[PDB]
Amino acid sequence: MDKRRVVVTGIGAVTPIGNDAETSWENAKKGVNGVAKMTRLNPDDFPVKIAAELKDFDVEKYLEKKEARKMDRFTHYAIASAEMAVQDSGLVIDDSNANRVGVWIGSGIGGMETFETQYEIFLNRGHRRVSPFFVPMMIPDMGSGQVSIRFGAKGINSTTVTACATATNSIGDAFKVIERGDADAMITGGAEAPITKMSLAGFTANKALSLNPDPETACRPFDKDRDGFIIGEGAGIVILEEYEHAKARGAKIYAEIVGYGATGDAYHITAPAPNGEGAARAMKMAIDDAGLTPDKVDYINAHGTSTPYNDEYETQAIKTVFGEHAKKLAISSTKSMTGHTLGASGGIEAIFALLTIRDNIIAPTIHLKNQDEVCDLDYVPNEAREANVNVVISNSFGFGGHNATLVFKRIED
């Protein structure tokens, strides 16, 4: 097995700070806050009053009204992001190569809004009324299913569901498909539309969400006063592509994907393991996969949920893996701006990590005002920073004990 090299040739995203990847990243560098008073639901009806919503997203740029009604919102986001990514990549999928192009897009909770709506119909009007398209619309693999059909991609069509790590695992899994020679390109990432009444009820019952109603201070990763995550929505998709294939067609290359690590806490269903034990192993595995020593990493895009346990445990895991180098590298949580997008977070964040390499500029952790005595590394608080960044990692340490890290490196043939 001669491992193939794999590069990123296309990006696409819809996020609370932009309806395309470039606008999202331009806003990230500017420290734009995507958290605001909730509008998707009536904030009077919930203990949580804020959320990070897509602003003015227009699904009709992608789908006719008839088609869109047959898809949950999370699938709208997957479709729009995949479309922008495929277009961005310039990759042409036709009869000659369709078998070699696959799809690996995850969602953490899938079509929650559809289940709510359809269940209420069931209760009120009975079983006959339930839509023929209920099951497909709700299941988390409908992102992959619809994207495969839309672009004619006939290679592996799969979906990984790992909560917060959903998109990070999905991209790594797609990376491994190409690495072992089983595809030449993969449309991959994650998509989530979790701003629904049941989703909020659940995370609130679990005490996972900050109840701070001030959009200006609620989400503050690594801050001494952080008290829980802020829910967000969106999707991030990349086109992964075998290196020779990309070069042959003259593809633009964002970076090489070089490492994938994934481990389990085996600790608790919602609480992360003390000291970031599992997270540490995931990062170490990812850099080992890339054949890099820890000192090679320049930037970590942190899971950065803004929970008391996560941000501290993640800091501890970083110290564990990077030792003397932990204080030398730079870290940021862009969740400080996008909120926690759940399953889609790894996709959005991989894109930010990639564009950090392109622009040699690191997006800030915003709202970092009160230094935590335990979280004492360099979080690039408040303002963007110019830095020579050649190697980046992106962390997702999700509920369910799912740990995943990806490593990207500046392209050098």
Q: Which residues contact 162 (CB under 8 A, 6 or more apart)?
A: 106, 108, 168, 169, 343, 398, 400, 402, 404
Single out the residue of 374, 263, 381 nearest to residue 309, CA to CA.
374
User: Please, how many CA atoms are within 13 Å of residue 354, restricted to the half-sphere of its CB?
Assistant: 30
CATH of 2-255, one of 1.10.580.10, 3.30.565.10, 3.40.47.10, 3.40.50.1000: 3.40.47.10
| Domain residue spans of the chain | 2-255, 256-400
Same CATH topology for 2-255 and 256-400: the answer is yes
**320, two tokens:** 């564990």
**145, two tokens:** 């299913």
Are 285 and 295 within 8 A, CB to CB? no
Residues known to be catalytic: 164
- CA torsion 382-389-314-281 (nearest 10°) is 170
Query: For residue 349, which amino acid is it?
Result: E
Distance, CA of 40 to CA of 215 (rounded, Å): 15
Distance, CA of 131 to CA of 331 (rounded, Å): 46
Query: For residue 382, which amino acid is it?
Result: N
| Homologous superfamily assigned to 256-400 | Thiolase/Chalcone synthase (3.40.47.10)
Single out the residue of 221, 352, 329, 248 nearest to residue 283, CA to CA.
329
Resolution of the experimental model, in Å, one decimal: 1.9
